[PDB]
C-alpha cells in the first residue's frame, strides 16, 4: 500500500494491547535502576552507573543531562534514541521560552514531549523509545516529579523507581519514604533504595545523586556523592 | 521458496530472473531480421494479427529521417520510449541543428531503462527495437534487450524461432555487404521465410520491409510496396 515511507508498524493484539511498545518496557526492566523522590522543598534523583570494566572513567559520560538550569532529569533502560529526544526537547523548550518569556514548568515539558513521544510510537518503521524519563524541576514555587513511559503515559509519584526490580524498590519507597522530608533526608533514602539492587561496592562513580533546589537544579559532583555516601545512606 | 519472493534477490547462481522473464516477451514477438551492408541497410519485420479481419499489426515505423526501426515485445513501454525517441531526435535537430548518431543515441536508451531495472517494485522494459541509422561513418545495426545491452553488428534476428535466420545469416551476412538494394531486400526476406512455417504464406501484407541509406530517406514499405520485393523469387524446397 501507498509509498513505503514507513507506515505504522504498531498493530492491536486480539485483546487490544500494544505489541512493540510493551516490548520496550522489557528494555526498561532489563535496564539500570534509577530512582527519584519528590519531597518538600525540591526533588532528588538517585541514578546508578557502574563500569563494566576497570578502564571506564565515569568523569566523562554523565547520566544526568539537565534540560534547563532549573530542570533536572534521569532515565532508565536504554542512549542512542535517548539523545535524540533530549536535544529535541532543547529545541522544543525554546518556543515556550521565547514566546511566553518564562522558565517553562516541568508539566509543560510533559505535555509537549509525551505528545511527540506518543506520535513517535504511532509512526512506524522506527523502534519506539525504550527510555522511561523521570522529569523534575521547580515551577511556581512548588516542584514536581513526573514519570513517563515508552507508551507516553505520564504519572506523578512522590518517590519513584525504575529498572530491575522496580516493583520491589517502589514498596520500599512507599514505606521508608512518606509524607515529605528535607532534601538531605531525601538523598538518604534515595541511596538506600538504590543500594537495594546495587552491588557490594559503592563509590563516588557508582552512584550519582542529582537534586532540584527551589533555586533551580544543581548537579552534585562525585565529590559530594562520596562525602554523603561512603558509608552509604 | 521464501527467498525467491522479491526482485532484489540474486539467484544462488547470481542471476536476476526478472530480466530473463522479460526476455520471454521479446522471443514471443514476430520474427524480424535487421541487417546492413557496407553501402545500404535493409530491415525486415513480420506482421501479426489476432483474427482474420484484423489488420496486420505494423512493426517497422519511421522515426528519424535516416533512422528506421522495428519493434517487438511490450507495446506499452515501447510507445512510451517512442515519445521519448521523438524527443531526442528533435532536440539535436533544434539546438544542434543536426541529427544524432545511433552510437551515442542508444547509449541514452540503455541508461533510460537502467533505473526501472534497479529500484524495488520497478519493472524492466521488454524491447525488440532493431535500429538502423546513418552517421558520417555509415550504417549501424544495434539490438535492444531488457538488460539494456546494445551490440553493434551488421545483422541480427529476434522474435519467435528467429535463430533459424541467423544460421542463414552467418554464411550469407558476410556476403550481403556488397549487394545493392534490389537483390538485398529479396535476399532479406529469404532469411525470414524459414522462420515462418513452411506450409503456408508469407503473404504480401503480413511482412514488414524498410530501406534506408546515406542519401536515401527511410520510407515504410508494406502491403503493395512489398509486391516488387516478393516477385521473381524461388520457393523453398521440400
Amino acid at each position: 500500500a501507498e509509498r513505503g515511507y514507513s507506515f505504522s508498524l504498531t498493530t492491536f493484539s486480539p485483546s487490544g494491547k500494544l505489541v512493540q511498545i510493551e516490548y520496550a518496557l522489557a528494555a526498561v526492566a532489563g535496564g539500570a535502576p534509577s530512582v527519584g523522590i519528590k519531597a518538600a522543598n525540591g526533588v532528588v534523583l538517585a541514578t546508578e552507573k557502574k563500569q563494566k570494566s576497570i578502564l571506564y572513567d565515569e568523569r566523562s559520560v554523565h547520566k544526568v543531562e539537565p534540560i534547563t538550569k532549573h530542570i533536572g532529569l534521569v532515565y532508565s533502560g536504554m542512549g542512542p534514541d535517548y539523545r535524540v529526544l533530549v536535544h529535541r526537547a532543547r529545541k522544543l523548550a525554546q518556543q515556550y521560552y521565547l514566546v511566553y518569556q518564562e522558565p517553562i514548568p516541568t508539566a509543560q515539558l510533559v505535555q509537549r514531549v509525551a505528545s511527540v513521544m506518543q506520535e513517535y510510537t504511532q509512526s512506524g518503521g522506527v523502534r519506539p523509545f525504550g527510555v522511561s524519563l523521570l522529569i523534575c524541576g521547580w515551577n511556581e514555587g512548588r516542584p514536581y516529579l513526573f514519570q513517563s513511559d515508552p507508551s507516553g503515559a505520564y504519572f506523578a509519584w512522590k518517590a519513584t523507581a525504575m529498572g530491575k526490580n522496580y516493583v520491589n524498590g517502589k514498596t520500599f519507597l512507599e514505606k521508608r519514604y512518606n509524607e515529605d522530608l528535607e532534601l538531605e533526608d531525601a538523598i538518604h533514602t534515595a541511596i538506600l533504595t538504590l543500594k537495594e539492587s546495587f552491588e557490594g561496592q559503592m563509590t563516588e562513580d557508582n552512584i550519582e545523586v542529582g537534586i532540584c533546589n527551589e533555586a533551580g537544579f544543581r548537579r552534585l559532583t562525585p565529590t559530594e556523592v562520596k562525602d554523603y555516601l561512603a558509608a552509604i545512606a | 521458496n521464501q527467498y525467491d519472493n522479491d526482485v532484489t534477490v540474486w539467484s544462488p547462481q547470481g542471476r536476476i530472473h526478472q530480466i530473463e522473464y522479460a526476455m520471454e516477451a521479446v522471443k514471443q514477438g514476430s520474427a524480424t531480421v535487421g541487417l546492413k551492408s557496407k553501402t545500404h541497410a535493409v530491415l525486415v519485420a513480420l506482421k501479426r494479427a489476432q483474427s482474420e479481419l484484423a489488420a496486420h499489426q505494423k512493426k517497422i515505423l519511421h522515426v528519424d529521417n535516416h533512422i528506421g526501426i522495428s519493434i517487438a515485445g511490450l507495446t506499452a513501454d515501447a510507445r512510451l520510449l517512442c515519445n521519448f525517441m521523438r524527443q531526442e531526435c528533435l532536440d539535436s535537430r533544434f539546438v544542434f541543428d543536426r541529427p544524432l548518431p545511433v552510437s551515442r543515441l542508444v547509449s541514452l536508451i540503455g541508461s533510460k531503462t537502467q533505473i526501472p531495472t534497479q529500484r524495488y517494485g520497478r519493472r524492466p522494459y521488454g524491447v525488440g527495437l532493431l535500429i538502423a541509422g546513418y552517421d558520417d561513418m555509415g550504417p549501424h545495426i544495434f539490438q535492444t534487450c531488457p538488460s539494456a545491452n546494445y551490440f553493434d553488428c551488421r545483422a541480427m534476428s529476434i522474435g519467435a524461432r528467429s535463430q533459424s535466420a541467423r544460421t542463414y545469416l552467418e554464411r550469407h551476412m558476410s556476403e550481403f555487404m556488397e549487394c545493392n538494394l534490389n537483390e538485398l531486400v529479396k535476399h532479406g526476406l529469404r532469411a525470414l521465410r524459414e522462420t515462418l512455417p513452411a506450409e503456408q504464406d508469407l503473404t504480401t501484407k503480413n511482412v514488414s520491409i524498410g530501406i534506408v541509406g546515406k542519401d536515401l530517406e527511410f520510407t515504410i514499405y508494406d502491403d503493395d510496396d512489398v509486391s516488387p520485393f516478393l516477385e521473381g523469387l524461388e520457393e523453398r524446397p521440400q
Partner: protein, 240 residues
C-alpha cells in the same frame, strides 16, 4: 522468539531483542583486524596493523590510518567499505565546527554528533546499519589527551583506554591490571604497552612495516605519525 517476516527487516522482536543489530557483531570478523587504544598523561597511542596477502599491496593505499583533523586523527575496524562513508561524515561535522565555532572541536561530545548520524543510519526504515566502528583521539586545552571509541549502535563512548572488537576483549583484560594498581604513563611507556596488551592475545611479532602505531602527544598539538623509522626503535626498546 521470532514471528512473521520480522527476520527479513530491521525492527524489534516478539521478545524485544534484536537480530540484525546483533548480526553486526561478526560483521567485523570478515575484516579480521584489531585496534587497541592506550592513553598516557600527556600522550595517547593507538596500535593497528594490516594484512598483506600479496606483494602487490601498496602501503599508502591500504593504509588503515585515517586523519580527520590536523590536531585529531582516527582509526576504524571491520569492513573498510562502511568505514569510508563514515570518514567524510567525521570530516564534515569537523569542518562545520572549525568554520562556525573556530576552536579545538568537541574533544568530549563530538562522539554524540557522530553517533547521531550513526543512529540515523540505524534508525532508517530500510538501510544498512553500517557496522563499522569509529575510534577517535582528542586534544583539549589543559585537559590532556582524550581517547574515544564509538560503536555503530548510535551511542557515544570513550574513556582513558578502550579496546573493542574481535580479539580486543582479551586486550582490555591486561590494560585493567596494567593501569591500576597505581601508575603513571610516559610517551614510550604507552607505546611499549600497546604491544604488551596485544601480547596477551596474539602478537605474531614480525616486521613492523605491516603494523601501524598511531601516536598523539602534546608538544605541537597537531596529530601526525612517522613512517617506519623509530616505530621499530620503540619495538626494540620495549624488548631488552
Amino acid at each position: 522468539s521470532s514471528a512473521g517476516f520480522d527476520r527479513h527487516i530491521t525492527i524489534f522482536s516478539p521478545e524485544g531483542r534484536l537480530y540484525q543489530v546483533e548480526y553486526a557483531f561478526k560483521a567485523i570478523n570478515q575484516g579480521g583486524l584489531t585496534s587497541v587504544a592506550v592513553r598516557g598523561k600527556d600522550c595517547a597511542v593507538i596500535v593497528t596493523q594490516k594484512k598483506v596477502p600479496d606483494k602487490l599491496l601498496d602501503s599508502s593505499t591500504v593504509t588503515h590510518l585515517f586523519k580527520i583533523t590536523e590536531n585529531i586523527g582516527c582509526v576504524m575496524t571491520g569492513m573498510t567499505a562502511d568505514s569510508r562513508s563514515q570518514v567524510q561524515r567525521a570530516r564534515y561535522e569537523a569542518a562545520n565546527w572549525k568554520y562556525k565555532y573556530g576552536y579545538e572541536i568537541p574533544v568530549d561530545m563530538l562522539c554524540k554528533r557522530i553517533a547521531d548520524i550513526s543512529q540515523v543510519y540505524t534508525q532508517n526504515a530500510e538501510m544498512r546499519p553500517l557496522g563499522c566502528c569509529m575510534i577517535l583521539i582528542g586534544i583539549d586545552e589543559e585537559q590532556g589527551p582524550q581517547v574515544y571509541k564509538c560503536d555503530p549502535a548510535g551511542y557515544y563512548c570513550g574513556f582513558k583506554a578502550t579496546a573493542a572488537g574481535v580479539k580486543q576483549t582479551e586486550s582490555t583484560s591486561f590494560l585493567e591490571k596494567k593501569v591500576k594498581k597505581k601508575f603513571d604513563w610516559t610517551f614510550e611507556q604507552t607505546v611499549e604497552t600497546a604491544i604488551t596488551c596485544l601480547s596477551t592475545v596474539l602478537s605474531i611479532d614480525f616486521k613492523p612495516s605491516e603494523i601501524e602505531v598511531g601516536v598523539v602527544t602534546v608538544e605541537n598539538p597537531k596529530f601526525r605519525i612517522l613512517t617506519e623509522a623509530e616505530i621499530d626503535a620503540h619495538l626494540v626498546a620495549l624488548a631488552e
